[PDB]
């Protein structure tokens, strides 16, 4: 029994079976936090992850800070970009935007409040800040566009 | 402009564009709760849903009561079956099971506590109740099996 974690073979009282592979239980641990995996685990090909780290790594990224947002965290969004509460802020003045605040979504994800928009376009889609929502962990979503 | 909601055509000041179709804003509403849809909407083919109802309808079902569990709700699970807190109960005595409780998972989803198991097999995989978790809205998951 070769343990796919640490190529020593496996003598232990109890043997783990996962990903059709054989593990010491010390070795079937999260690739990223090295916490031992029980009952189920998540895998990206070759490597195994605990749930937290799988979503941090492979989950929807904050467009501002680029860190993984788990399905658990409430977020702000602009079009198909998603942002942490603390990251949905004007990139020029750094003010945290709020529901009903007028801003512009730039072509690179950048958020610019209305008052700084002349400034940023010298260096844009206008929008009104929507209320936060539970982040939908990447759910194929359809736009609702408006025409007058 | 034929509104795909209510086949009257569309005269309104403002017109909605969604699913490459044209809507009165009164008519681009949730198929199930008839609440008006804004910014994004979710669709199962032909019909459109608000987020709640999409997950209630197309989300992971409680194995006991068969109702849709949104990614937001904490659940109990046995193998690849998921259960509401209030539905992870013995099917014979109706007692709500708790972390560390010994039970059997039957071949039909049915949960039977250890004390009633001789009884239920006359009419089974033994298991120990795991702590509740945030429900993973149907995430492809790998089993960790044990061999002595
Ligand atoms: Zn090992
Ligand atoms: Zn981890
Ligand atoms: Zn962020
Ligand atoms: Zn600003
Ligand atoms: Zn209509
Ligand atoms: Zn609805
Ligand atoms: Zn239920
Ligand atoms: Zn019972």
UniProtKB/Swiss-Prot annotation, chains A, B:
Q: Domain (LIM zinc-binding): give its ranges.
A: 3-53, 62-116
Covalent S-S links between cysteines:
none
Residues bearing Phosphoserine are 43
Q: In which tissues is it expressed?
A: Mostly expressed in the pituitary anterior and intermediate lobes. It is also expressed in the pineal gland and transiently in the primordia of motor neurons including the spinal cord, pons and medulla oblongata.
* GO CC, any one term: chromatin
One Gene Ontology biological process: somatotropin secreting cell differentiation
Q: Which GO terms describe its molecular function?
A: DNA-binding transcription activator activity, RNA polymerase II-specific; RNA polymerase II-specific DNA-binding transcription factor binding; transcription cis-regulatory region binding; transcription coactivator binding; transcription coregulator binding; zinc ion binding
> What superkingdom does the record give?
Eukaryota
Indicate where this protein resides in the cell: Nucleus
Q: Which UniProt keywords apply?
A: Activator, DNA-binding, Homeobox, LIM domain, Metal-binding, Nucleus, Phosphoprotein, Repeat, Transcription, Transcription regulation, Zinc
Q: What is known of its domains?
A: The LIM domain specifically interacts with the POU1F1/Pit-1 POU domain and is required for synergistic interactions with POU1F1, but not for basal transcriptional activation events.
Listed under subunit, the entry gives: Interacts with POU1F1. At neuronal promoters, interacts with LDB1, in motor neurons LDB1 is displaced by ISL1 and a ternary complex is formed in which ISL1 contacts both LHX3 and LDB1; allosteric structural changes in the DNA binding domain of LHX3, induced by the ISL1-LHX3 interaction, may explain differences in sequence specificity of the different complexes. Interacts with LDB2. May interact with CITED2/MRG1.
The record's function comment reads: Transcription factor. Recognizes and binds to the consensus sequence motif 5'-AATTAATTA-3' in the regulatory elements of target genes, such as glycoprotein hormones alpha chain CGA and visual system homeobox CHX10, positively modulating transcription; transcription can be co-activated by LDB2. Synergistically enhances transcription from the prolactin promoter in cooperation with POU1F1/Pit-1. Required for the establishment of the specialized cells of the pituitary gland and the nervous system. Involved in the development of interneurons and motor neurons in cooperation with LDB1 and ISL1.
Instruction: Tell me the protein's name.
Output: LIM/homeobox protein Lhx3
Q: Which span of the parent protein is shown here? A: 32 to 153 of 400
